[PDB]
Design a protein around this ligand. Structure first.
Ligand SMILES: [Zn+2]
Ligand SMILES: [Zn+2]
Ligand SMILES: [Zn+2]
Ligand SMILES: [Zn+2]
Length: 117
DNA sequence: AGCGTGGGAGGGTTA
DNA sequence: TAACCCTCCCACGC
């Protein structure tokens, strides 16, 4: 399954790719060489992709646009869940007894599940 | 309730 | 040999 296993004592985390393991290894070492050099910000990241995603907050760039209402979004995963507001898709159904409510996002189902109990 | 929108994280592809 | 792009998990706020 996962041939790349973390060698840190007690971690026991395994990965499919070596790049995934080397990316995880910075969690133990704590190195965050990708600092944000914008003013009034001290955010640091161990990954370059997380820094550039964060720096969209400073630049205001929204590269992902909804083809229905033309609204732009900073992140592609948030455009995907926004599209369900137009299509009405709710792929996450509550499995509580007698309940039939469905939700477009998983965190909405988790919040609804916590309301049952 | 429904949904915008961050960080943290793991999947993938690519010279 | 990591940068790059993707969605998910979890969280916070209105
Ligand atoms: Zn580890
Ligand atoms: Zn910043
Ligand atoms: Zn839209
Ligand atoms: Zn329910």
């Amino acid at each position: 399954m996962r041939p790349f296993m973390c060698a840190y004592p007690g971690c026991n985390k395994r990965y499919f790719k070596l790049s995934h393991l080397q990316r995880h290894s910075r969690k133990h070492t704590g190195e965050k060489p990708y600092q944000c050099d914008f003013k009034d910000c001290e955010r640091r990241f161990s990954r370059s992709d997380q820094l550039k995603r964060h720096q969209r907050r400073h630049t205001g760039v929204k590269p992902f646009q909804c083809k229905t209402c033309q609204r732009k979004f900073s992140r592609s995963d948030h455009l995907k869940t926004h599209t369900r507001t137009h299509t009405g898709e709710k792929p996450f159904s509550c499995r509580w007894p007698s309940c039939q409510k469905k939700f477009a996002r998983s965190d909405e189902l988790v919040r609804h599940h916590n309301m049952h109990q």
